[PDB]
């Protein structure tokens, strides 16, 4: 039941992006608002090497199977950083509660969205290639560094990248839902 | 005899996630500028670019058409104000088009009283999306809210209509005239201004 699956996937991706956007805004107001962290966060997302469409015209041009594949790769690529985000933050003596609560919900809901996505692919493209190709995040040393400024900047970049990729996943899913179910007549 | 004061890029907005515009103001206090130049570069690139359209957006603005706008890629921008005496540069502004989205208001708001046999009567509200937005491909997603109130009431009643372009309202006061407006926001970003009001008299026999 493709319409029900797409509907639920888009509820999740929009809810995840909302949580990531609020997390980034709360971290920003509370730790980084005063010093050049936004200048430091330029060009440094682990998913940058994926060929992702940058406007709706590139999106429309994407082969449907590869576009769905791409969403799946971005979600699979975030499993590792979300795990460490939550682990690191929960391990603090004084964990900023609102931030931690959002990170744990995103960690949990991303897994569900990836499960919904894998079911979509199964239904729409049953002979997909099951090989994984997603980009590796390896920034745990920078999250764990003692230097409070280098550490805050590492967190800033992680949260800025999360808000961006959660947005892209949501926007790409909405594009695909409308293309698949409605022939781009939503 | 004085160089310009320090200008400031104070607002950027995208109506539809396909173009955007930014606006700056002069410094107070310094000399009159005779030129402004807005330049920028993008995350991941070293190329410096000039504002591609100083006209569309009106005074002291830079408009980025479809060829120059993309999401998920930070713009780093600066404006300089010059005269024959010297120059001043704004602070750098970091812009992700993703987070400056604010649609124009919905269009064609229309209101009709419906009185069906043996079922509750209702006000039927209908409207259309702003013209600049592409909902059909799924590129853009709009949520809508209606408000309505009689004149001299202290509070508006607000109804969230989700992604619908029509709505039914049941509890209205017979004989009263209501002002109705609609507004919309993307899934992520800012509410539009309320549309202009449409007015409706609810009949005495309601
Ligand atoms: Cl708002
Ligand atoms: Na614009
Ligand atoms: Na201008
Ligand atoms: Na564009
Ligand atoms: Na972004
Ligand atoms: Na009218």
UniProtKB/Swiss-Prot annotation, chain A:
Disulfide bonds join 45-161, 178-186. The keyword Disulfide bond applies. The keyword RNA-binding does not apply. One of its GO terms (molecular function) is hormone activity. Its main location: secreted. One of its GO terms (biological process) is prolactin signaling pathway. Glycans are attached at residue 18. Keywords: Disulfide bond, Glycoprotein, Hormone, Lactation, Phosphoprotein, Secreted, Signal. The modification Phosphoserine is found at residues 13, 21, 77, 122, 153. Belongs to the somatotropin/prolactin family. This is Prolactin. The lineage of its organism: Eukaryota, Metazoa, Chordata, Craniata, Vertebrata. The gene is PRL.
UniProtKB/Swiss-Prot annotation, chain B:
Zn(2+) binds at residues 187-188. GO terms for cellular component: cell surface; endosome lumen; external side of plasma membrane; extracellular region; plasma membrane; receptor complex. Glycans are attached at residues 35, 80. Keywords: Disease variant, Disulfide bond, Glycoprotein, Membrane, Metal-binding, Receptor, Repeat, Secreted, Signal, Transmembrane, Transmembrane helix, Zinc. Expressed in breast, placenta, kidney, liver and pancreas. The WSXWS motif appears to be necessary for proper protein folding and thereby efficient intracellular transport and cell-surface receptor binding. Belongs to the type I cytokine receptor family. Type 1 subfamily. This is Prolactin receptor. It comes from Homo sapiens. The lineage of its organism: Eukaryota, Metazoa, Chordata, Craniata, Vertebrata. The chain holds residues 26 to 230 of 622 of the full protein.
């Amino acid at each position: 039941m493709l319409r029900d699956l797409f509907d639920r996937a888009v509820v999740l991706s929009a809810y995840i992006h909302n949580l990531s956007s609020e997390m980034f805004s709360e971290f920003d107001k509370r730790y980084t608002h005063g010093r050049g962290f936004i200048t430091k966060a330029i060009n440094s997302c682990h998913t940058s090497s994926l060929a992702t469409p940058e406007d709706k015209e590139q999106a429309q041009q994407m082969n449907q199977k590869d576009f769905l594949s791409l969403i799946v790769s971005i979600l699979r690529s975030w499993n590792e950083p979300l795990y460490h985000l939550v682990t690191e933050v929960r391990g603090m003596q004084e964990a900023p509660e609102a931030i931690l609560s959002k990170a744990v919900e995103i960690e949990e809901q991303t897994k569900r969205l990836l499960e919904r996505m894998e079911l979509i692919v199964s239904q729409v493209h049953p002979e997909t290639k099951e090989n994984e190709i997603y980009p590796v995040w390896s920034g745990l040393p920078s999250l764990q560094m003692a230097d409070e400024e280098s550490r805050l900047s590492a967190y800033y970049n992680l949260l800025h990248c999360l808000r961006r990729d959660s947005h892209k996943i949501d926007n790409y899913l909405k594009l695909l839902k409308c293309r698949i179910i409605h022939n781009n007549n939503c | 005899m004085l160089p310009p004061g320090k200008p400031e890029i104070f607002k950027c907005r995208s109506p539809n996630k396909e173009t955007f515009t930014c606006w700056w103001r002069p410094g107070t206090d310094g000399g009159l500028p005779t030129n402004y130049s807005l330049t920028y570069h993008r995350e991941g690139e070293t190329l410096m670019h000039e504002c591609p359209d100083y006209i569309t957006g009106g005074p002291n603005s830079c408009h980025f058409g479809k060829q120059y706008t993309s999401m998920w890629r930070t713009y780093i921008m600066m404006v300089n104000a010059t005269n024959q005496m010297g120059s001043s540069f704004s602070d750098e502004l970091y812009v992700d088009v993703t987070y400056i989205v604010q649609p124009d208001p919905p269009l064609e708001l229309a209101v009709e009283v419906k009185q069906p046999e043996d079922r509750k009567p209702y006000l039927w509200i209908k409207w259309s999306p702003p013209t600049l937005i592409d909902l059909k491909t799924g590129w853009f997603t709009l949520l809508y809210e209606i408000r309505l109130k009689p004149e001299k009431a202290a509070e508006w009643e607000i109804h969230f209509a989700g992604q619908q372009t029509e709505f039914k309202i049941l509890s209205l006061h017979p004989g009263q005239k209501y002002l109705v407006q609609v507004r919309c926001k993307p899934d992520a970003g800012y509410w539009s201004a309320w549309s202009p009001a449409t007015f409706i008299q609810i009949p005495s026999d309601f």
